[PDB]
Amino acid sequence: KKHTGYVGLKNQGATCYMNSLLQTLFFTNQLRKAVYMMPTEGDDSSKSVPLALQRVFYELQHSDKPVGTKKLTKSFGWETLDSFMQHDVQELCRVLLDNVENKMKGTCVEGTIPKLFRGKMVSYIQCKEVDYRSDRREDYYDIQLSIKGKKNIFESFVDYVAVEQLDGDNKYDAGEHGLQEAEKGVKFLTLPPVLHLQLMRFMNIKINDRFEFPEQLPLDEFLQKTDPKDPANYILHAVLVHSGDNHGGHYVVYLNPKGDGKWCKFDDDVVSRCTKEEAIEHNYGGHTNAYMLVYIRESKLSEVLQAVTDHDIPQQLVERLQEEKRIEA
């Protein structure tokens, strides 16, 4: 904390990618404030996932020493290494934020999860030579981008929206109209304030290819309609990295918490300052791979990364967490 201003977490081992995600969610400041507001006074000390996330966030905000996650792993039942390796980061993040969102219902901080992370997309199937079109509106909290044969995020987004032909052997079952030539596609209606992009490093053959992501990411061309008052310019907030072995390896996260190009490497207990280039360019890959990226929308940056004070944690919660620290010591 003395060098960088920020504390790290206790070592991974079986934990894998949780520490990387916890720092990412902790430095989503608007979420952190909302997490502190959850009415967890009635909750069980051990079994409550909402309370266990308040504990980590509290300790990341106040501790000089590294913060433990053992109370938190016991709460949502992922104790073994197998339980992390079977899942991916978006599934873990979904498990934490569902608990948080459910606890926030009927409270002053309701709807903070969908405000921060929920975007909307339309999937469509249009028949070419017949008048039939199926549409589904879908909420998403995260996007999984393809990287095999893609130079960069721009190209992955182009491929994400690209129109697929349903011709020949793979014609579209159109019900009363029978098999038809058709065009399948997806289109983004809105992009959230905090954008979670996972990069598909497994097709399970692994992909160590060089994949380039920028500091500033404009996404207006991937929307159906563009607001001129609020363009879809996104700014790079976090880069989650894996090195070494599969079914194992070492997980790190790079972060610029204030959103001001001032980057730090979060290597469990060791938080240290780094260059933009160590955080961005040097995690592109080729012959160490980035696997998740977090972008924040430029128009939403002040609100998402709003300053936290110790006053933002309710007195009842502070007293309860210090009662644990006294009794356990």
Ligand SMILES: Cc1cc(Cl)cc(-c2ccnc3cc(CN4C(=O)CCC4=O)sc23)c1O[C@@H]1CNC[C@@H]1F
């Ligand atoms: C071993 C390993 C290496 C790398 Cl470099 C990234 C991940 C990783 C960690 C967390 N989250 C994601 C999300 C990803 C994107 N992705 C999907 O969602 C479906 C297919 C895929 O690629 S890769 C990854 C990883 O660990 C993984 C855990 N479970 C499977 C691996 F063992």
